[PDB]
Each structure stands twice: as structure tokens, then as C-alpha cells.
Design a protein around this ligand. Structure first.
Ligand SMILES: [Mg+2]
Length: 267
């Protein structure tokens, strides 16, 4: 069962411990009182629905920077899935480039810029809190790590009902912040101690956090890179916004020394 964590918990040591234990045992958690404007989130979702209605030949202009960071149309691999996105979402130039490509209106440009900075602010706060929950000295470990923005459109038709939308996976980055569709949902995750699945329902004004492959590597196996998938529950349209804190660009990432020792051998 995925825990919900109150980011306005007054005690840092209780908050950090709750974050750490969620992240170790389940690899994901929900946050409430996250500090992100609710109206900004709703405005982002409307912008997303609108960006996906852009002419096809406009969407194809969303070109890759990292492989897969740009536009993807549904195909025979992922029949129900369409996506747009941008690499280095912490860079205002990257965000504007994306807005240029998709012919974002002025308002839409500003929504994106303010969403990017808010969500990215939250991601770096959660990352610092994870370092704090371990009592690490490297409380700035994430500061040269790029983030990636991806917006998704799921199209489920009546034949899809009762089966999966996209199949089971782990994210490859460090941490992911998901603004899921409050009206649809169906995200599910594997409990590694039983193989049983539990749901991550879209509770309104909340965000879903999950950890990825980079977090397990970084914490030398302690953080759970959770396995998850989205199941189709009804033939409908579903929109989600994902923000990925990735690992290092350049460098090949290994763990802070504190994590590696005789009882926790290196990986
Ligand atoms: Mg995922």
C-alpha cells in the first residue's frame, strides 16, 4: 500500500524518516501539502490537453535532445500512448524552445515556465530530504543533475478495457513526480515482497512520487526502483504530467561512500 506523506509535517526528522522508509520499502509515495499552486497544476493540465491537439506536423517538431525526450506518436509497440517532452527542464531556454516548437500561446508559455520551476523546486527538495534522512554530508548531490519534462496522452478504446495500457517498468532516473489524471487513474505498482500489485489512485491536488534506477544505484541498493504500470479501467482519454530528476549527464554515477561498506557491498 502506497503511503501518503504530508510535506508540511512540522518535524523534519519525522518527515525525512517517513520519506526514507516509504522510498526503501515501496519505492513510491504520494505527497500532499506539496507547495505547488493548485491552479497552476490545473492550468498545466489544460495546456497539455491543448498542446496535444496541435497539428501533427507541429508536434513532430518536438525533437529529441536525449533519445526519447521529444515527441512520440502511438505505434504498434505502444498503441495507446502519445507523448511530448523536453530535456533540461530546469533551463528556461529549454522550456522556451519547447514552447517555440509547439507554438505555445503567451499564456501557455508562462504556465509552462512557472510549472517547470515549481515542480523542479519540489524535486530538489525531496532529493535533499532523502540525503537528510540518511544523515549524509552531500546534501547538494543532485545540483548538477538535469531534469526532464514529459506530458502524456493515453487513449483507451473499448477493447482495451480490462487490460494494461503500457506494460510493467522501472523509471531510469533518480526520482519522478507525476501529476496523474484525477478523472481516470489506474496506475499500479509491484510490491517486491509478494509480487502482488497495489493501485496508485489519483487523489485530487496530490502528486505521486516514485524512485527510479538511478536512486537504487546511488543508495547502493537501499532505495526501491519501483516497478509500475498503468491499467485500463475504462475506454477513455487520460492525461498525465511527469517530471523526471535524472542522474548525472557526464559522469557515470556511483554512490556516496557512506552507503557502501562491508555489510552493503558495492553494486
Ligand atoms: Mg513510469
Amino acid at each position: 500500500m502506497i503511503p501518503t506523506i504530508d510535506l508540511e509535517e512540522v518535524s523534519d526528522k519525522i518527515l525525512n524518516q517517513k520519506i526514507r522508509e516509504a522510498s526503501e520499502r515501496w519505492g513510491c509515495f504520494r505527497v500532499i501539502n506539496h507547495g505547488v499552486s493548485l491552479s497552476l497544476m490545473a492550468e498545466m493540465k489544460k495546456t497539455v490537453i491543448d498542446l496535444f491537439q496541435r497539428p501533427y506536423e507541429v508536434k513532430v517538431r518536438n525533437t529529441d535532445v536525449l533519445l526519447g525526450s521529444g515527441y512520440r506518436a502511438p505505434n504498434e509497440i505502444n498503441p495507446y500512448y502519445e507523448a511530448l517532452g523536453l530535456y533540461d527542464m530546469a533551463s528556461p531556454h529549454a522550456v522556451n524552445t519547447f514552447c517555440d516548437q509547439l507554438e505555445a500561446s503567451a499564456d501557455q508559455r508562462e504556465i509552462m515556465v512557472k510549472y517547470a520551476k515549481a515542480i523542479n523546486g519540489l524535486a530538489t527538495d525531496l532529493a535533499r530530504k532523502l540525503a537528510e534522512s540518511y544523515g549524509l554530508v552531500e546534501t547538494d548531490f543532485f545540483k548538477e543533475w538535469p531534469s526532464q519534462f514529459r506530458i502524456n496522452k493515453y487513449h483507451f478504446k473499448p477493447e482495451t478495457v480490462g487490460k494494461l495500457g503500457v506494460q510493467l517498468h522501472t523509471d531510469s532516473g533518480f526520482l519522478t513526480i507525476l501529476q496523474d489524471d484525477e478523472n481516470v487513474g489506474g496506475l499500479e505498482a509491484m510490491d517486491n515482497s509478494s509480487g502482488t500489485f497495489f493501485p496508485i489512485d489519483p487523489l485530487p491536488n496530490t502528486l505521486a512520487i516514485n524512485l527510479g534506477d538511478m536512486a537504487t544505484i546511488w543508495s547502493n541498493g537501499r532505495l526501491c526502483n519501483v516497478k509500475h504500470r498503468v491499467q485500463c479501467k475504462e475506454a477513455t482519454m487520460r492525461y498525465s504530467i511527469a517530471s523526471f530528476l535524472l542522474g548525472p549527464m557526464d559522469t557515470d554515477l556511483e554512490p556516496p561512500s557512506e552507503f557502501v561498506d562491508a555489510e552493503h557491498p558495492r553494486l
